[PDB]
Amino acid sequence: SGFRKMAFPSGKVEGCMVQVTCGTTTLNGLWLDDVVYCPRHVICTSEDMLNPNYEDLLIRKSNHNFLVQAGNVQLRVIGHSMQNCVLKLKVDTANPKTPKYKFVRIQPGQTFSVLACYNGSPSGVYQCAMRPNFTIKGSFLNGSCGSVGFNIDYDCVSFCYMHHMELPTGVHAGTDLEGNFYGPFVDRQTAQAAGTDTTITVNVLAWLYAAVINGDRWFLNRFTTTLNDFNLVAMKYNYEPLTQDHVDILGPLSAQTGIAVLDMCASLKELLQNGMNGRTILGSALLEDEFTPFDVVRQCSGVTFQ
Amino acid sequence: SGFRKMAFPSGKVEGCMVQVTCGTTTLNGLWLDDVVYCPRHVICTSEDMLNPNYEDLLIRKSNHNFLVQAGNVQLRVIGHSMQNCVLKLKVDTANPKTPKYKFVRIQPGQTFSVLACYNGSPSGVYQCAMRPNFTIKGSFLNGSCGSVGFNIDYDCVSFCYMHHMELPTGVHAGTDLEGNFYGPFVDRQTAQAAGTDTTITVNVLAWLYAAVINGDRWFLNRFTTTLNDFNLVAMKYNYEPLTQDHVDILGPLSAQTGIAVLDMCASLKELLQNGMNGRTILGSALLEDEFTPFDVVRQCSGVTFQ
Ligand SMILES: *[C@H](O)[C@H](C[C@@H]1CCNC1=O)NC(=O)[C@H](CC1CCCCC1)NC(=O)[C@@H](NC(=O)OCc1ccccc1)[C@@H](C)OC(C)(C)C
Numbered sequence: 001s002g003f004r005k006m007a008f009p010s011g012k013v014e015g016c017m018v019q020v021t022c023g024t025t026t027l028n029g030l031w032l033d034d035v036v037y038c039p040r041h042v043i044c045t046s047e048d049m050l051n052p053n054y055e056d057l058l059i060r061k062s063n064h065n066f067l068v069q070a071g072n073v074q075l076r077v078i079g080h081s082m083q084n085c086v087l088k089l090k091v092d093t094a095n096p097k098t099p100k101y102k103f104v105r106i107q108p109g110q111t112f113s114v115l116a117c118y119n120g121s122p123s124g125v126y127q128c129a130m131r132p133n134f135t136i137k138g139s140f141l142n143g144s145c146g147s148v149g150f151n152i153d154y155d156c157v158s159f160c161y162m163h164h165m166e167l168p169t170g171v172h173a174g175t176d177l178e179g180n181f182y183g184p185f186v187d188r189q190t191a192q193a194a195g196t197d198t199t200i201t202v203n204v205l206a207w208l209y210a211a212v213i214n215g216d217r218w219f220l221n222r223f224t225t226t227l228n229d230f231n232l233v234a235m236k237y238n239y240e241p242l243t244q245d246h247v248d249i250l251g252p253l254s255a256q257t258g259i260a261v262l263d264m265c266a267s268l269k270e271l272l273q274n275g276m277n278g279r280t281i282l283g284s285a286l287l288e289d290e291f292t293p294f295d296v297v298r299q300c301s302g303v304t305f306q
Numbered sequence: 307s308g309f310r311k312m313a314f315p316s317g318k319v320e321g322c323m324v325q326v327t328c329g330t331t332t333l334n335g336l337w338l339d340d341v342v343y344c345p346r347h348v349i350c351t352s353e354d355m356l357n358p359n360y361e362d363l364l365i366r367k368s369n370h371n372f373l374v375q376a377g378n379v380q381l382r383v384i385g386h387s388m389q390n391c392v393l394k395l396k397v398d399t400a401n402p403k404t405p406k407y408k409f410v411r412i413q414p415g416q417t418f419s420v421l422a423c424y425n426g427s428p429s430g431v432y433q434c435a436m437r438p439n440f441t442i443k444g445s446f447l448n449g450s451c452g453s454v455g456f457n458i459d460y461d462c463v464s465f466c467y468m469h470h471m472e473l474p475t476g477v478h479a480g481t482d483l484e485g486n487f488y489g490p491f492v493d494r495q496t497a498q499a500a501g502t503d504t505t506i507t508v509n510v511l512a513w514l515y516a517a518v519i520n521g522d523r524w525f526l527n528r529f530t531t532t533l534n535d536f537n538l539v540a541m542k543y544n545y546e547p548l549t550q551d552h553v554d555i556l557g558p559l560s561a562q563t564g565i566a567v568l569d570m571c572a573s574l575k576e577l578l579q580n581g582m583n584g585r586t587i588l589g590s591a592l593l594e595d596e597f598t599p600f601d602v603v604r605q606c607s608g609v610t611f612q
């Protein structure tokens with residue numbers, strides 16, 4: 001028992017991280033087979049950053065402008081192309097550590113592990129959620145661009161995030177691995193703000209189930225509620241609407257604990273209306289929303305990865 | 307910016323995990339050079355567990371009683387010895403993925419990453435602290451014994467924990483990698499309880515510095531306090547005494563933020579006496595104590611690992 005903010009084991013991704021230097025910019029790249037993926041703003045200079053035209057910028061580049069360092073090994077760029085906001089550097093060597101992988105674009109509310117890197121070297125791993133406003137609340141300093149987010153499914157690494165930038169509230173924005181930003185953000189250093197965020201309701205409910213699975217039951221009640229009546233309460237507290245498909249996803253957890261989804265909804269409704277009143281759930285005094293239903297089932301039943 | 311509960315990259319440890327089966331017990335082992343380390347209770351049967359004499363139990367074992375599985379590769383045990391509460395299985399193959407490593411026994415209040423494993427396969431990685439009562443608040447199910455905790459220092463993996471057991475409050479106990487339990491616990495299935503825990507004061511102060519480094523300043527004040535006067539307040543709220551050596555450790559953080567340690571102590575003192583009053587620090591409504599001063603400096607300046 002117990003319940004922790006748990007990241008996937010990061011070994012399969014660590015074997016893909018490289019350093020990419022161009023001009024005065026150094027950031028991280030992802031080395032899969034003979035291609036290195038990195039943010040296209042690696043080709044911007046300290047004054048191109050305001051309104052860059054990346055097609056012009058890139059056509060002025062030669063392959064030898066790109067310094068790719070894989071550990072103590074300098075990799076030779078033999079070609080480059082831009083796909084949306086990511087640069088793809090064709091290199092002459094296939095990464096022998098390339099895992100089985102996929103590129104996926106995730107939905108808001110889904111979670112992933114971030115492998116924070118600097119100069120091609122991993123610094124730390126942590127769990128994130130794609131917030132409803134398409135930012136992530138990460139931990140990223142200068143040089144971290146090109147760090148990736150990912151999920152592991154048995155043996156397959158699904159990459160879903162590459163880091164590009166930090167917004168003024170301290171939260172983070174980036175793209176999928178095909179270079180499409182999450183959210184309305186653009187890589188260009190003009191004024192942008194995150195947009196109002198909301199709480200991921202289905203995830204809060206999954207975490208309340210995690211709590212029950214782990215012996216916290218003090219927040220439960222006899223009441224039930226209708227989805228309609230729950231969603232009126234959610235709105236007022238800035239929670240995502242709970243859909244019927246959310247309710248279905250929560251089915252396994254509901255069945256394992258014997259608490260009907262709409263009953264947990266009545267519990268959450270009282271937690272929103274009364275607060276927690278000096279009590280904690282799973283070591284938190286806040287309602288936690290960065291565990292998906294799958295996250296809860298995985299950690300509470302012990303799924304592993306080869 | 308941002309601040310997350312950050313684990314070390316787990317690749318170096320994942321390459322050491324193996325499955326160890328003996329009788330009807332399966333758990334995890336740590337494969338370093340030609341030795342596999344695992345909990346000695348792997349040799350207990352479902353009724354030896356009450357008052358086992360492990361010397362008798364082990365002398366009745368033959369090497370071929372130990373099934374060691376390294377992926378799709380069955381490893382041959384050529385010898386075994388017991389060291390305190392860990393079994394060491396000599397195997398005929400050196401692990402080619404053996405990292406640079408050390409075995410360290412940590413002090414309470416120190417943090418580490420746990421690589422949760424089942425059947426030799428990593429399930430997830432998360433950050434822990436050795437609690438003052440020598441338990442860890444982990445996430446561990448049946449089959450997780452033999453999972454290890456560790457810190458990484460540049461290129462060297464310092465192993466500090468191996469998982470052995472779960473106590474009735476849901477927290478966890480285990481040993482260092484030389485088999486000495488943390489705390490008064492013994493591997494034997496008789497009544498044991500954790501003992502009263504306390505809050506790791508120096509870590510709370512480091513996290514308050516993390517908050518300042520990241521733009522949270524609402525909890526600061528003009529007051530100062532004496533170490534003596536602070537510790538009278540700490541005691542009443544079940545906090546570890548803050549030593550002068552703690553104050554010294556907090557020096558770099560103090561110098562980087564311009565907030566004298568004893569001034570942060572005045573802030574913590576008011577947080578204890580008034581609570582947070584609907585406000586959060588670094589996304590928490592609780593005072594967080596599982597970041598050491600080194601953890602804060604590492605994450606707020608971007609140290610990496612080769
Ligand atoms: C790559 O390693 C870094 C990672 C950042 C740095 C600190 N934390 C991080 O995660 N990325 C950057 O430094 C990028 C680089 C530009 C990206 C766009 C195209 C040109 C290169 N810049 C930023 O992340 C800045 N954010 C930003 O410009 O956002 C738009 C904006 C501009 C002006 C006002 C409001 C919003 C960061 C570094 O600037 C602030 C921290 C001041 C927001």
Ligand SMILES: *[C@H](O)[C@H](C[C@@H]1CCNC1=O)NC(=O)[C@H](CC1CCCCC1)NC(=O)[C@@H](NC(=O)OCc1ccccc1)[C@@H](C)OC(C)(C)C
Nearest residue numbers: 347446447448449450451471472473474493494496497498
């Ligand atoms: C190894 O994979 C597991 C890991 C446990 C299982 C669930 N969570 C975990 O982290 N370890 C065990 O199952 C060990 C095995 C024994 C260890 C001692 C020597 C013999 C083998 N057992 C326990 O962890 C039990 N705890 C325990 O016995 O503690 C002492 C005790 C006994 C009786 C009353 C109070 C305290 C667990 C499984 O039992 C409880 C969960 C009921 C505490």
